[PDB]
Design a protein around this motif. Structure first.
Motif, PDB file in Angstrom:
ATOM      1  N   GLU A 172       0.825  -1.199   0.000  1.00  0.00           N
ATOM      2  CA  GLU A 172       0.000   0.000   0.000  1.00  0.00           C
ATOM      3  C   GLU A 172       0.857   1.244   0.000  1.00  0.00           C
ATOM      4  OE1 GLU A 172      -2.101   0.601   3.984  1.00  0.00           O
ATOM      5  OE2 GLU A 172      -0.099   1.599   4.106  1.00  0.00           O
ATOM      6  N   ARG A 173       0.272   2.365  -0.414  1.00  0.00           N
ATOM      7  CA  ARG A 173       1.046   3.585  -0.425  1.00  0.00           C
ATOM      8  C   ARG A 173       0.891   4.182   0.972  1.00  0.00           C
ATOM      9  NH1 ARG A 173       0.832   9.104  -0.565  1.00  0.00           N
ATOM     10  NH2 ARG A 173      -1.314   9.896  -0.555  1.00  0.00           N
ATOM     11  N   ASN A 187       8.220  14.400   2.710  1.00  0.00           N
ATOM     12  CA  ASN A 187       8.158  14.235   1.272  1.00  0.00           C
ATOM     13  C   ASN A 187       9.080  13.165   0.709  1.00  0.00           C
ATOM     14  OD1 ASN A 187       5.907  15.728   0.619  1.00  0.00           O
ATOM     15  ND2 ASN A 187       7.086  17.610   0.183  1.00  0.00           N
ATOM     16  N   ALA A 188      10.229  13.047   1.342  1.00  0.00           N
ATOM     17  CA  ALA A 188      11.223  12.082   0.934  1.00  0.00           C
ATOM     18  C   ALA A 188      11.144  10.674   1.559  1.00  0.00           C
ATOM     19  CB  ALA A 188      12.580  12.713   1.215  1.00  0.00           C
ATOM     20  N   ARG A 189      10.193  10.424   2.461  1.00  0.00           N
ATOM     21  CA  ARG A 189      10.083   9.082   3.123  1.00  0.00           C
ATOM     22  C   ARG A 189       9.803   7.907   2.217  1.00  0.00           C
ATOM     23  NH1 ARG A 189       5.037  11.079   3.112  1.00  0.00           N
ATOM     24  NH2 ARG A 189       3.318   9.544   3.135  1.00  0.00           N
ATOM     25  N   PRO A 190      10.070   6.683   2.645  1.00  0.00           N
ATOM     26  CA  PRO A 190       9.817   5.497   1.820  1.00  0.00           C
ATOM     27  C   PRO A 190       8.381   5.512   1.445  1.00  0.00           C
ATOM     28  CG  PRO A 190      11.064   4.825   3.733  1.00  0.00           C
ATOM     29  CD  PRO A 190      10.803   6.332   3.861  1.00  0.00           C
ATOM     30  N   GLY A 191       8.111   5.139   0.212  1.00  0.00           N
ATOM     31  CA  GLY A 191       6.753   5.150  -0.323  1.00  0.00           C
ATOM     32  C   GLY A 191       5.624   4.440   0.392  1.00  0.00           C
ATOM     33  N   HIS A 192       5.958   3.314   1.039  1.00  0.00           N
ATOM     34  CA  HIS A 192       4.879   2.599   1.729  1.00  0.00           C
ATOM     35  C   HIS A 192       4.664   3.083   3.147  1.00  0.00           C
ATOM     36  CE1 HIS A 192       8.203  -0.246   3.475  1.00  0.00           C
ATOM     37  NE2 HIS A 192       8.078   0.788   4.308  1.00  0.00           N
TER      38      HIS A 192
END
Ligand code: ATP
Ligand code: ATP
Ligand code: MG
Ligand code: MG
Lengths: 157, 157
Positions: free
Chosen positions: B1-2, B122-127
């Motif tokens: 999931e995102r 903004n830069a955190r891991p996508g999930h």
């Protein structure tokens, strides 16, 4: 900035070109870009000629690619091999942009699992922008995308 | 999931509790969570007592924290020290959820740069899902968030 997902689809010309014009812009700006081309051309790669020497990684489908119904096993394996590189790029925090050229066909012909695609996109580094190109992009990828531009062929030479 | 960004703000009670109820759910589901509490309580930490033993990392502001106008230098340093841990969690691909409890006050009192906050989010891991709590959350964080629930105190004992 937050990375987004851009899709250039439609039957009009300019999808691959838009994507590489985007990559060029990014490179011109000092950003790191990686590229995967799901379809091998019989011609010399101008984009690659230009970008590659700037440190841009390029991953191209193997020459063996057949599209032949009889060879799906072998073809899917090659597709999967190239995708391995893509997944890696989609997981690299240091890559500002990833270009997935003609990826739509891979999904449209079932040589690449959609789920695998949605997952890797969803899980990418946050600042990572991904550009996807190809005619007939899968609806589920289109939904995930932030910007979708459809190239409508009003005219073609 | 995102992963998404959830904000529990408002003057009503239940912000911190909602956040930890979310973290509990996540833990109950086998996910990895990390927590940063920007405000130290004089009381024993029930949430921490419960979660910590499940492997959940907890980072709490140092006891020294004054809020005194005269001590801004020292206070900001402590704030920055704790935030260092947060930034790390916000960069860990293996962390499914990060809780930033009472972070609003840090920004509201300028002990933590907003820009630094927006960037790390903004830069955190996508999930990665992030939960932010606190009264008066900065408008720019609210805009970045995917879900914002405002606890309106209709009544309080
Ligand atoms: N409507 C069309 N009819 C014929 N050839 C086309 C058409 N659209 C694009 N082409 C060309 O066919 C090849 C495959 O292109 P593709 O279908 O991927 O289009 P494209 O990516 O939009 O093209 P381009 O690389 O020029 O931007 C290209 O060399 C491309 O220039
Ligand atoms: N309107 C209120 N008036 C007085 N005390 C409150 C009010 N809202 C919350 N509290 C309590 O004040 C302390 C600080 O809480 P805070 O302002 O962070 O609210 P909260 O996070 O929504 O509370 P809680 O931890 O119970 O969910 C808590 O112990 C909290 O229970
Ligand atoms: Mg193309
Ligand atoms: Mg609270």
């Amino acid at each position: 900035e937050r990375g987004i997902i851009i899709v250039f689809t439609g039957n009009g010309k300019g999808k691959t070109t838009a994507a590489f014009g985007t990559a060029a812009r990014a490179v011109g700006h000092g950003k790191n870009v990686g590229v995967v081309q799901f379809i091998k051309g019989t011609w010399p790669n101008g984009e690659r000629n230009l970008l590659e020497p700037h440190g841009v990684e390029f991953q191209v489908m193997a020459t063996g690619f057949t599209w032949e119904t009889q060879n799906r096993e072998a073809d899917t394996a090659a597709c999967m091999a190239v995708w391995q590189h893509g997944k890696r790029m989609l997981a690299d925090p240091l890559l500002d942009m990833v270009v997935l050229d003609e990826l739509t066909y891979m999904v449209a012909y079932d040589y690449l699992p959609l789920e695998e695609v949605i997952s890797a996109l969803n899980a990418r580094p946050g600042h990572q922008t991904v550009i996807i190109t190809g005619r007939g992009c899968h609806r589920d990828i289109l939904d995930l995308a932030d910007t979708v531009s459809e190239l409508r062929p009003v005219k073609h030479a």
